[PDB]
Amino acid sequence: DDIYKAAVEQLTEEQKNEFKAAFDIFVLGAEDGCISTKELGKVMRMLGQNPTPEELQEMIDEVDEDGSGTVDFDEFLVMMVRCMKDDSKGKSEEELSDLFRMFDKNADGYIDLDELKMMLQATGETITEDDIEELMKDGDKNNDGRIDYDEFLEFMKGVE
Amino acid sequence: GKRQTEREKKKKILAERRKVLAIDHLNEDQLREKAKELWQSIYNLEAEKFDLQEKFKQQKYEINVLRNRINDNQ
Amino acid sequence: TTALVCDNGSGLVKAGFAGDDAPRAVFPSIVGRPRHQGVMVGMGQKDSYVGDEAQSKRGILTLKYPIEHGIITNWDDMEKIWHHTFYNELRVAPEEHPTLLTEAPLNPKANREKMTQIMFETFNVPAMYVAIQAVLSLYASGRTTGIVLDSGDGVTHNVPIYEGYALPHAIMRLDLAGRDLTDYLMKILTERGYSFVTTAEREIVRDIKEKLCYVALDFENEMATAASSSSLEKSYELPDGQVITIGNERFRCPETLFQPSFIGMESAGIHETTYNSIMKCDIDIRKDLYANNVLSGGTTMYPGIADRMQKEITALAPSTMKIKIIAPPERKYSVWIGGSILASLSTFQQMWISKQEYDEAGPSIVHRKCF
Amino acid sequence: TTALVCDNGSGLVKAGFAGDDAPRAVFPSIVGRPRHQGVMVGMGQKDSYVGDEAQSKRGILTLKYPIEHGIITNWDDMEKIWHHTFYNELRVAPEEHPTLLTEAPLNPKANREKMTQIMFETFNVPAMYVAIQAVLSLYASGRTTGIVLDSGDGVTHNVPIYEGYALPHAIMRLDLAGRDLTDYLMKILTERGYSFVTTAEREIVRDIKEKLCYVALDFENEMATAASSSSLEKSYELPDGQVITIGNERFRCPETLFQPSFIGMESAGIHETTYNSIMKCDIDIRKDLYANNVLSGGTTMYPGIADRMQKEITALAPSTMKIKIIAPPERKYSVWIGGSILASLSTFQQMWISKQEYDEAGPSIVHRKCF
Amino acid sequence: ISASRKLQLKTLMLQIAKQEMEREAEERRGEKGRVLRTRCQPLELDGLGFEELQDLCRQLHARVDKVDEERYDVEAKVTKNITEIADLTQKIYDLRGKFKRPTLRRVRISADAMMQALLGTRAKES
Numbered sequence A: 001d002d003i004y005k006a007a008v009e010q011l012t013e014e015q016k017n018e019f020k021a022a023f024d025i026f027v028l029g030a031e032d033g034c035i036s037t038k039e040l041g042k043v044m045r046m047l048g049q050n051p052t053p054e055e056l057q058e059m060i061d062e063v064d065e066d067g068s069g070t071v072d073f074d075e076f077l078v079m080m081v082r083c084m085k086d087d088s089k090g091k092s093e094e095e096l097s098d099l100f101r102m103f104d105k106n107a108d109g110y111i112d113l114d115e116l117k118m119m120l121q122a123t124g125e126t127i128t129e130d131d132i133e134e135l136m137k138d139g140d141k142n143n144d145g146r147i148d149y150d151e152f153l154e155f156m157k158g159v160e
Numbered sequence B: 001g002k003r004q005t006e007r008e009k010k011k012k013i014l015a016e017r018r019k020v021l022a023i024d025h026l027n028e029d030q031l032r033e034k035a036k037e038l039w040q041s042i043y044n045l046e047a048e049k050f051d052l053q054e055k056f057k058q059q060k061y062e063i064n065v066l067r068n069r070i071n072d073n074q
Numbered sequence C, D: 001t002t003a004l005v006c007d008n009g010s011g012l013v014k015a016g017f018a019g020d021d022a023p024r025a026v027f028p029s030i031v032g033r034p035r036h037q038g039v040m041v042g043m044g045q046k047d048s049y050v051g052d053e054a055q056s057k058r059g060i061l062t063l064k065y066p067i068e069h070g071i072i073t074n075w076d077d078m079e080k081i082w083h084h085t086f087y088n089e090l091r092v093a094p095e096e097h098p099t100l101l102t103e104a105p106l107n108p109k110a111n112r113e114k115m116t117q118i119m120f121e122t123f124n125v126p127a128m129y130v131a132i133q134a135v136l137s138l139y140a141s142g143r144t145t146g147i148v149l150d151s152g153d154g155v156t157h158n159v160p161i162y163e164g165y166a167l168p169h170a171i172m173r174l175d176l177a178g179r180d181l182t183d184y185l186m187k188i189l190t191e192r193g194y195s196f197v198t199t200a201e202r203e204i205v206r207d208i209k210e211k212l213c214y215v216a217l218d219f220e221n222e223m224a225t226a227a228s229s230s231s232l233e234k235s236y237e238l239p240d241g242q243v244i245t246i247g248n249e250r251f252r253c254p255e256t257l258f259q260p261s262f263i264g265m266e267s268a269g270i271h272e273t274t275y276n277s278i279m280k281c282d283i284d285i286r287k288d289l290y291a292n293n294v295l296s297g298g299t300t301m302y303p304g305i306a307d308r309m310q311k312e313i314t315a316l317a318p319s320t321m322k323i324k325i326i327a328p329p330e331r332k333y334s335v336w337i338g339g340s341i342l343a344s345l346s347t348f349q350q351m352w353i354s355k356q357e358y359d360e361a362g363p364s365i366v367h368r369k370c371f
Numbered sequence E: 001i002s003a004s005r006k007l008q009l010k011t012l013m014l015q016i017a018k019q020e021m022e023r024e025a026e027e028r029r030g031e032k033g034r035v036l037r038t039r040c041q042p043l044e045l046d047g048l049g050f051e052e053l054q055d056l057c058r059q060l061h062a063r064v065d066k067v068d069e070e071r072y073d074v075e076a077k078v079t080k081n082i083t084e085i086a087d088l089t090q091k092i093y094d095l096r097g098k099f100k101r102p103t104l105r106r107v108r109i110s111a112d113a114m115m116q117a118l119l120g121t122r123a124k125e126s
């Protein structure tokens, strides 16, 4: 997901040029200029790793939102780093659940966005009102005006 | 009777917690020690009851969460 | 605050807050433990499904009613049913609500005393009161006289009342009711080939009885007609297909009410125990009881019973008296509607058995002035 | 640590670590001693080639499966197969990994007890658990009800499950499976001139069956069509040339599943033992079992079986019920995927048979609470 | 917006919530000790006649009885509450679980090993 987008944003032109040269060397002779789902799967089977074609479709849907089955530079790096899924288990569940439950200081079962605002003021990361709005949209799936506990699980799912 | 059993069980726990307070034969320091034992028991029960209160507040909020999710699960 | 008008019944528990028109939650009173082994892990399988949940998983349960004939035979299961009723079907803690249970006439004392002891110790209600199931059904009709035949699912009882003064020497309680009709229907269905044995299939036979059976106006003529034509054979689709066709079993199942010799019972039918209950009354209130005969309870919902009963009583009674049978369309919940009306009265507000009174006299308080 | 989800099977051993999508190593379970004399010295000739190595040197070996029908008939060879599976195909010592074997229903006890004794004494695992091969296939489908027909290569068994409660009285185990179909195909190929006799050529006939045979939607029409036209004759190249042409042997080999009278077996086909297994269940869960019929196992991979079986059951079943046949594309490894899911559960983590428990009660611990 | 900033927000919120909950728990412990010492009051009556000592002993035995009865009733009630909470949790899970089965992947072996295996001998720098 956008996890790999964050990971590659952590990465720099070193990884960009390294994978560009790897493309120049191994994808040499391919008429694509990118890596296709079928090409990637066949090459993996050639080397020995045999992921499912359903995984190919999933990954292509993820990185290549347009459904072309190719990999644009940013989504290409995202797909390439997607193979190495070192970070799993998504931090802790129950302790973070307690943290989120106490986040509802009003304890009404409703997480006001203003509590999030205060916590972000504590964080102070470079963010505008539209940014936190978009993040809440990514979190407030049912659009109930709060952070739902199930949606709290959803947006922090797999998140370390 | 299961409810008879519960009432009798709580009464028996009460009876067990009642120690033999036959101490007048003892000297002043020993009586002070016994009073300290009772005091420590009371303070420990105070800590236990405080934990009960905070955990019951958490239980109530989590039951609110449960009811909210019940509403969500229509 | 508001009062909880619960009504244990036997077959359907009906409950709801006082002052409404219909019970809030109506669900069968069955508690069924699973009987097979169970191989899926973590499926979240409970140890006992009660109420309406066990009417959906009844394929792998062994349903067993906790109330046999008015009396309660399995106190743990009844406590479980009450706990479910309070907490999940109404979601009101009992610590803040008076309760008004209902009880059949002529029941064992120990049943009533245990009921009040449970309500005061386990659920810890503020105050509870136990009322006879027929007086409420008389409340709901808006009358003040009349002889009410409350043919429930457990027990059929016939309480005559005049001007508000109940006649305790004229109560005729008979133990034939809907459950025996279900068993007899399940027993006569075997004459065509359909065998229902499992305690789960008793529910299917009950559904057949509810949807198809009717009371014949004249029994011999119907028996002759069903044996020549085929205009009566109505079909019904089981929960898996294989439709069945019920012939003259349709009006033979509920005929047991008027001829209890079918299931081997000695006593006379519900058409003659009402007349006997009237004749035990004084000679000057028989006309009013004749004119205000009231029907209630679930089992009196058979299509065509309010005419058969009137014909029978008119045959028995003197020719001059007018026989009228009150059969309101809201028959099933008549007892509960009457219970709501009684609990909503201001004059009744001081008859509750307050908890301090129970603490001073023990569970035997119910037989005392607070009846 | 991680658990080893082994699955002995009969014909293909499938193994891999818990929590993945597909087994790591899949290889035939055959152990073949050489049969000729051998003249080259120092060639490094071993005394028994097991697993996939003996499918390449099968020209001079005598392959013999160590598992006949679910049960294990040759314990030394099975021990050799397990040793190979642990050390060479996975390269993980068993001293540091729990194991989850699988076993067909209704198998002899001694087989299971010997299996656990071997796993605890020879390989010395920390803890092992034995599970019925059908419950896993139900796990993999993500259901919790349904009747699963797991037609493996050794034995075909049909376990119905509802709401997680298995019905032990409705398991119908039939011993017709892929191996008997291979033998019958090898027997009907002789009607054209091709004779396969050697135990090595049974593998060639198995390959023919896998690549060419299909299940006919209607048997008589196909028999009539194949006897007039020639649109069915598909050819196949043996491991040395001399192509062969299979005519109406294509759909006659797998037809034995629905008419076990072909190989002389008395019982009814897999289309009628499923209906019988359903009809033994209670009357209220038959609709759910009808709607959630699950297929699994290798032999249910014939092209066109999910339609023939549905047509047959729809013919047998009542006309109102909906018949649906779940045939996931990952049928072959369904049991192992389910095994991985079950081993990955947290609720299941305390059901393993810990070694100290075995030391206290002996191998008969498997029949006890830890099933 | 960018995803890196969103991940930074996520981890910062993790830290903020954890620290606030921890500080709240610390305050709860401090106030617990403070209020309980304010409730359980130490005494000092040494050297006194054993009559007064025994009167204090009986008073405190009764006090022990009262505190035990109250706290044990409260604990029983809280255990009942926790049991009911677990029942509701199981009910809500059964209503909204099932699909809740996670999936684990070991197919995604280390990507550097994949690059090495593909490039074969030429797998020198990648």
Ligand SMILES: Nc1ncnc2c1ncn2[C@@H]1O[C@H](COP(=O)(O)OP(=O)(O)O)[C@@H](O)[C@H]1O
Pocket: C008, C009, C010, C011, C012, C013, C151, C152, C153, C154, C178, C179, C182, C206, C209, C210, C211, C297, C298, C299, C301, C302, C332
């Ligand atoms: N519409 C109906 N037609 C015929 N019989 C019915 C009908 N509804 C309910 N019954 C019978 O009445 C019984 C329910 O009676 P009910 O009045 O609920 O008993 P209780 O007095 O215990 O509440 C059922 O068991 C059923 O056999």
Ligand SMILES: Nc1ncnc2c1ncn2[C@@H]1O[C@H](COP(=O)(O)OP(=O)(O)O)[C@@H](O)[C@H]1O
Pocket: D008, D009, D010, D011, D012, D013, D151, D152, D153, D154, D178, D179, D182, D206, D209, D210, D211, D297, D298, D299, D301, D302, D332
């Ligand atoms: N694609 C296929 N088409 C037809 N039959 C197959 C196919 N794949 C496997 N089989 C049959 O199924 C058998 C393998 O079944 P399997 O599920 O491995 O048995 P087990 O339950 O012992 O693992 C093989 O012997 C073969 O006869």
Ligand SMILES: [Ca+2]
Pocket: A103, A104, A105, A106, A107, A110, A111, A112, A115
């Ligand atoms: Ca909030």
Ligand SMILES: [Mg+2]
Pocket: C009, C010, C133, C150, C152, C153, C297, C298, C335
């Ligand atoms: Mg009634």
Ligand SMILES: [Mg+2]
Pocket: D009, D010, D133, D150, D152, D153, D297, D298, D335
């Ligand atoms: Mg198998």
